[PDB]
């Protein structure tokens, strides 16, 4: 399948904590990905012969900023792609990827943002997860904070990752308290909050926008992992999550036959459907990614080995693993990203290197 066709290193020599292809590319435009590390975001274009063409960076005004994460969306009126970034300052920046201008920013967490994700159906709904133990849902069309997911029954330590399900009806989050929590956003209260957020225009009213305080997850478990839970993804109604214990677990809330939409807040069972083990990934903040179709899953480890699982099989435990190594790639890989058409897989590393793998 994949062959290593190129690599480079960014000039700052700090970790690249994240990478994301733009899956909102226009037909006929080249494939583009963003990296985040140090206090910058950088865009590169993929071309033939393994060329990774350097484009342009956004560099934060603050030399002490450290960007951790990025996520792509598009402007809902204009269709132009937008890039959100955030990190240790707890500030969300919305970046024009063409000019690399910061169109606008959001403050609130004040504390480190560990992940950003956009709703799979609504390009304006942005989820941020924080070192302050809360998640927040923003509407980046009307610049409103829709809701904060927190409270003593929410996470009790840094939230490290979160993922919306297929239709963006609910979010699974996870973090340093070892737990995974479900937050439904299709409730009456939440659907209304979102609609009211679209109705909010501060020039046409006197009121501040009111945020929902959501203090109770719709399900919680600490039975999956026994350390920091640092990456979570939906797989239909099942979950894939990992800690720093060299495993990705495929599980679901409740018993084997339980419908995800009939699970109650007090559900105390989970069901384990499989576990994909690998080696040398005991450090935390190491994310896997999946291709657009969720046919496959890629994870790098702390010494520069890639694992790829073919999930195109009848049950999760039947996943087929391939590994991808290069003799010059020995630094920790923090995250992978597939292009939308699945032909390229990029890994970024703690020594600021970028690795290109083509199918």
């Amino acid at each position: 399948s994949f062959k290593c066709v190129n690599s480079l290193k960014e000039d700052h020599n700090q970790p690249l904590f994240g990478v994301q292809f733009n899956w909102h590319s226009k037909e006929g435009d080249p494939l583009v990905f963003a990296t985040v590390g140090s206090n910058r975001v950088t865009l590169y274009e993929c071309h033939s012969q393994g060329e990774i063409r350097l484009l342009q960076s956004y560099v934060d005004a603050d030399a002490d900023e450290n960007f951790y994460t990025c996520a792509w969306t598009y402007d809902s009126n204009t269709s132009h792609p937008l890039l959100a970034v955030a990190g240790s300052r707890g500030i969300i920046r919305i970046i024009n990827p063409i000019t690399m201008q910061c169109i606008k920013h959001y403050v609130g967490h004040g504390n480190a943002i560990n992940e950003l994700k956009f709703h799979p159906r609504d390009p304006n709904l942005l989820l941020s997860v924080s070192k302050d133990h809360a998640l927040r849902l923003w509407n980046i069309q009307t610049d409103t904070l829709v809701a904060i997911f927190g409270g003593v029954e929410g996470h009790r330590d840094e939230v490290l990752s979160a993922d919306y399900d297929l239709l963006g009806e609910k979010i699974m989050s996870c973090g340093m308290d070892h737990s995974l929590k479900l937050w439904r956003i299709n409730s009456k209260r939440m659907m209304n909050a979102i609609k009211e957020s679209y109705d909010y225009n501060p020039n046409k009213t006197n009121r501040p926008f009111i945020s929902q305080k959501i203090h109770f997850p719709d399900f919680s478990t600490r039975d999956i992992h026994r350390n920091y839970v640092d990456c979570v993804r939906w797989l239909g109604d099942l979950i894939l999550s990992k800690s720093c214990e060299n495993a990705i677990v495929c599980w679901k809330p409740g018993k084997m036959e339980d419908d995800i939409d009939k699970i109650k807040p007090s559900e105390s069972n989970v069901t384990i459907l499989g576990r994909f083990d690998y080696s040398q990934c005991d450090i935390w903040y190491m994310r896997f990614s999946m291709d657009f179709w969720q046919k496959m899953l890629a994870l790098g480890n702390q010494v520069g080995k890639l694992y790829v699982w073919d999930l195109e099989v009848e049950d999760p435990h039947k996943a087929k693993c391939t590994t991808l190594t290069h003799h010059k790639c020995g630094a920790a890989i923090r995250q992978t990203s597939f292009s939308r058409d699945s032909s390229i897989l990029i890994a970024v590393c703690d020594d600021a290197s970028i690795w290109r793998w083509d199918r």
């Binding site: 970790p15 350390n227 720093c244 450090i283 935390w284 920790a332």
Partner: peptide
Amino acid sequence: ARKS
């Protein structure tokens, strides 16, 4: 658990 260390970050690096």
